[PDB]
Design a protein around this ligand. Sequence first.
Ligand SMILES: [Cl-]
Ligand SMILES: [Cl-]
Ligand SMILES: [Cl-]
Ligand SMILES: [Cl-]
Ligand SMILES: [Cl-]
Ligand SMILES: [Cl-]
Ligand SMILES: [Mg+2]
Ligand SMILES: [Mg+2]
Ligand code: NA
Ligand code: NA
Ligand SMILES: [Zn+2]
Ligand SMILES: [Zn+2]
Ligand SMILES: [Zn+2]
Ligand SMILES: [Zn+2]
Ligand SMILES: [Zn+2]
Ligand SMILES: [Zn+2]
Ligand SMILES: [Zn+2]
Ligand SMILES: [Zn+2]
Lengths: 376, 376, 380, 380
Amino acid sequence: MIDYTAAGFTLLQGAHLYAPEDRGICDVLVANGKIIAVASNIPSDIVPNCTVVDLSGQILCPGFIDQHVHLIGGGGEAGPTTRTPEVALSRLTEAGVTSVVGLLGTDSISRHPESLLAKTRALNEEGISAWMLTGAYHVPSRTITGSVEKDVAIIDRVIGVKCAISDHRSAAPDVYHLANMAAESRVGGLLGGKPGVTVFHMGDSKKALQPIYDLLENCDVPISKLLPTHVNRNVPLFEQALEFARKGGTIDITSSIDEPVAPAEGIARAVQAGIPLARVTLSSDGNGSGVAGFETLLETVQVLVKDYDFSISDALRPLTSSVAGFLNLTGKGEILPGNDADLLVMTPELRIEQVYARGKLMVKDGKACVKGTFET
Amino acid sequence: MIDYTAAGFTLLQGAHLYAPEDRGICDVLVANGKIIAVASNIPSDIVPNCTVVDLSGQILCPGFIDQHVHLIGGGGEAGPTTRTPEVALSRLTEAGVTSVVGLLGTDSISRHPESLLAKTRALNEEGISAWMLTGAYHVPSRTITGSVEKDVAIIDRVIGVKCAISDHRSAAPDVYHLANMAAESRVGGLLGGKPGVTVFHMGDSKKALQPIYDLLENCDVPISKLLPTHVNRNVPLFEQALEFARKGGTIDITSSIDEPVAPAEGIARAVQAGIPLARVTLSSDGNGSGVAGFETLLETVQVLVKDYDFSISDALRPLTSSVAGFLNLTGKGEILPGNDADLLVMTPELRIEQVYARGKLMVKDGKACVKGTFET
Amino acid sequence: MIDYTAAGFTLLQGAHLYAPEDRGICDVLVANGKIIAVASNIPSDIVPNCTVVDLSGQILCPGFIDQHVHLIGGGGEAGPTTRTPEVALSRLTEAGVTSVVGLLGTDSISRHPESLLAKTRALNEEGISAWMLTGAYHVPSRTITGSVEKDVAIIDRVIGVKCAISDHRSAAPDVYHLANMAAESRVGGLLGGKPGVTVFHMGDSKKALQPIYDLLENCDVPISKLLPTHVNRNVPLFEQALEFARKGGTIDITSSIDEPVAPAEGIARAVQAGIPLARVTLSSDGNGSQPHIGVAGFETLLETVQVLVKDYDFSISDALRPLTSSVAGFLNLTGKGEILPGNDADLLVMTPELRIEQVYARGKLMVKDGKACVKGTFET
Amino acid sequence: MIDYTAAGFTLLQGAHLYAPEDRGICDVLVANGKIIAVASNIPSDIVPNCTVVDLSGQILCPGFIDQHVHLIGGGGEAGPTTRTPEVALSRLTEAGVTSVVGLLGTDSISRHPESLLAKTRALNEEGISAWMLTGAYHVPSRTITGSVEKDVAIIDRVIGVKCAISDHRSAAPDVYHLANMAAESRVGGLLGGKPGVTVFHMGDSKKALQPIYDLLENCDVPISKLLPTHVNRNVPLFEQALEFARKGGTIDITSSIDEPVAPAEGIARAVQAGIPLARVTLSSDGNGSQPHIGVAGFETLLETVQVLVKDYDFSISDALRPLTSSVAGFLNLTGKGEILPGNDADLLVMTPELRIEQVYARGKLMVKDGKACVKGTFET
Ligand SMILES: [Cl-]
Ligand SMILES: [Cl-]
Ligand SMILES: [Cl-]
Ligand SMILES: [Cl-]
Ligand SMILES: [Cl-]
Ligand SMILES: [Cl-]
Ligand SMILES: [Mg+2]
Ligand SMILES: [Mg+2]
Ligand code: NA
Ligand code: NA
Ligand SMILES: [Zn+2]
Ligand SMILES: [Zn+2]
Ligand SMILES: [Zn+2]
Ligand SMILES: [Zn+2]
Ligand SMILES: [Zn+2]
Ligand SMILES: [Zn+2]
Ligand SMILES: [Zn+2]
Ligand SMILES: [Zn+2]
């Protein structure tokens, strides 16, 4: 018998597929970590050495893309005992996260972009998909190569730059500094084939988004590259964010911020305000500092469907297609032929059962079956 | 018989000469790459070992000076596969270009001033005349010696600095940065004997020339050193450029931009607006990124004469005397004794037949007869 | 009618397979740029929407790996007019090259690692597989990040460092500098998952391999990381290179140097000296300047294979090693140089007389009927 | 009446020509600063608007090339009052100098390469031909761009590097530093189209040429790029210099050092040692300090020529070599040091007893009746 095991053929059968678009009962054929066919009634024997998975009665959807994770650990605002630990592979996978964007925050003294890059690469070797943002709250940014533009252009895993504004922990950046940094990210992305975004950690200053508007007034970076995050942290800020989105920007809601605007609520409000889901993303801020977890992501989807009247498809957008679109994550956020085989298998009540990353089974019966090198 | 071949005597006979000024049927005597006599009926035997060229029925004019060429290649805005190739000698010559100013654009990460300088020097060794601008779209400028002023002052082939404004690919420069950069170019030019200009790649921002006006308000660089290019890229910008020119500035129209203001049209408009041709230049933006060619230069002259009622002399100004004047290109842009023997021989319909660079035959029957070292 | 095209199922049937190991007639099935099965008589219907290719009467082998190419151009030793142009995709592919390592030479003033990296990435995007070496002839190395160790560790496409020794164009490096550079590449390789090698452009100094020996005496970089290149440039050097190989080193023969030691001849002499083919590699030094001045091409690669088989008593299988498996092994090029399930679908289809017919790179047809059917973005 | 003046047609007629090769009576025609014909009996009417000069009874030879001049001034070894002033154009031209190489000495604190480059360019503008060396006595070299290699490659007027060895004013350079500096100049020369030489100011240490030999042992720079200067400063050094020359090196004798080995004497001894004149050069070390303290002048250049012919049995043709053809050859000074069609019109008109009458630089009359008729912008 010929050995075709190198293909890793996997047929996911009979689940109710949400691509996120509802596709009804539809099958998914995978080979080499890629989605090679998406159709009803794919023959269990279409390909050899095929692992057939009966997903009857289950739900199938794209894996989550969490664009705001402190991969190497964060914290440190109350001294060194508050530096959090690096993230564990299984914590991500059990949470349904198959793609991540790592970043740094307040501390860029004991935290380094080179370290973040190494962890990013470890995660990719481990089976998931990971990118990072150069910089940290500090402006001017602390980079790997000496320039934001050069980092985004030449460090493969770097997709944009991080910063903090309107926050008591900011570097008190002026418009010129912010604009130049964003412009550099933009240009570096073009060169490197990266989205070249600028992510803004928002604080509670009354100024809110003003720095972003000033920046817009002082440069030609498209508004589509400017991402304010933690927008639900305060009402007045949230309200500004809706306008920002109405103007063409994309806003990022933090699943780990419960009050004063809860995540689901935030997403619900956006839609009420007439903002298309494509301009609304949800991130966890996981692994920050207590120690932020990833459970709030799935919880958010559940709540949206359960308590807010969102369809399953719509509820998924902000964690899947909306993210992939904002970051130009080719091959992610959608179940289509040619895309990466990053999928979630859930109960009808939206409880995760299985997770596939790049076609590999990572979670089974809701428990990780692939663990990081040093996990216990 | 005595050998006088070292003189390279060449007598160009009987053509209708446009210096660009119309000189009627007039001859041109060349020696050692220089124009040594310009008169009617120069005796075919005035000098020995003389190559006599019968230009009866043909047109004779100065070679083109294209001040905006991506000599080493450009592009790269859609990833690395979009980096264009370096320019080929014959592409320039066949297009009637005998003098070039090379520059960099968006990408100053994988493109370097030292590389540009080497190509500039190769072209000079090859037979034409080439200069360059330090910097690139990026501001603050990336230079060879660490300072714009020092580059313009001490790198022989460097004549000014390049930058980008009002463009989604700019570095979001502030007035101080732009003004200081221009001031440095200005000062460096005085010291080095260079025009010390500042060239502005214009984008489509509604702000248009504002940065230039701000700059003027914040420094004492003469307006005659500030060159906005791509002025025909947008109407509103174009309209501002005419005012700028009316105020004493010189504006550069791109022959490779067809809409919304075509090159010829642009030049025609300028004259309608009462701007002297001396303050209007035309450049190709050749070798940029598809892959920009040089055919539009001559096409522009043809169209101006053919469809716009310009005399041959006037049509030539923006590619010859106007450029030479703006850049203080001593010995270029005009057929006069003492000037360099850079000439074009054309049909009455303005089709190029022969090209001479520094007195050497480069193109014959419209085809290059001198090719770069690695040309096929 | 279910659409399975995303898989890019391709079945190469009936050729005589050299993996490079001789496997006789055997089929190869490809999906998504990967070799998914290698066996005789694979059913044509085994997979849906499958492009079946009849290679009966032909030869199927791994694509070549050229570890020494001046991707962005080189030259410049006789002034700026001698700076060669960047390499065209089609010249590589039509020459059988599916994997390449780019590097710089004498000129590191008008040439920069950042430029080279961009070029490497373009080639990858166009369909082939490309890596590069940091540094250039100049020592201390001119790098991207400020340290050789750092470049190797953090720049994904960098796999080692380049240098020049025993040559009139060298930077007169001393042992310390050389050792330090070599150890940094080694360590950056470990951290980054790269081979972390040091490539030594050899010149004609009478000192030949001496600097390498001195280096080994002054550090602990494994001999398996030190690659002398252009070893066939002179007899005494060549002969020293055989000794070095006997001691556990790997030697790189330049296909474009035909005297005084021809490439096939050098390879045969290495074999006659007791060196296993795994320690002998062949590279082109393509795209550098060739004295009227020209650009060195890549045809000598395939010609060396032809010559070995025709005139030096080599089996096809062995003749292929120095361009395929030996290189991948030396550079730890995972998934390259061997036709095995799981490896990348980088294959050459040739006639029985070893002339290229088709070339597949990462499962994509790049050459058909001996002509590039896939070309660089701006290819002329 | 057609105007042909732009050509600057000039015809030097009837002199006895030393190209430096003896050519007997022969005419030289000039156009645009170039020599366009060299022959006997060139017709006076051959070209229009021609300035015909009757040089009957006179001598015509190439203009001198002084490769060692402190253009911006030097000195400073006895405090700031000993810093000499910049060189005046007229002092160079009246001394027969049409091509010069500027350099720095002991002081690289109050003296900078950027200053020197500006001065070099001024001289070019004024009508002569000037180049310079980067660095100074200090090693590591203090450069314009940050690297010796880079300066030589990219600064048009830089053609090599200067250093000091075996001298109480040296920077105590070790072999590595010296070798590295030398190899960078070499390589920058290749890229830039410069000779890429290294000039060694020699002192009186007993070590003499040792550092050069050590350098050769530690690198691959060709011996033809290493120029020891001031070789006649001491006997033992001079004698070592003869050996070095015998081995293929070129040696530079200083015209301003009259003991213990006089310049003509040193030149004659070089010849007597079997060294071809092509490997012997003479330079002034002009504009440095001369101990009451003064500025060293350039008259010793012509005097050495006079002395060789009068007292050392030299032909005029040979006596000229070390100031013309040997220098141009050593520095690859294209178009200089020889009267041949195509070369620059840099000529000296002298009496039969070798006293300067006229000087043409790039075809321009700079000296007439022995007096500068062309002077520096601010000349006093
Ligand atoms: Cl705050
Ligand atoms: Cl882990
Ligand atoms: Cl724009
Ligand atoms: Cl070319
Ligand atoms: Cl290509
Ligand atoms: Cl003066
Ligand atoms: Mg065997
Ligand atoms: Mg003789
Ligand atoms: Na690896
Ligand atoms: Na030269
Ligand atoms: Zn934050
Ligand atoms: Zn955070
Ligand atoms: Zn532009
Ligand atoms: Zn441009
Ligand atoms: Zn080499
Ligand atoms: Zn090479
Ligand atoms: Zn000295
Ligand atoms: Zn001196």
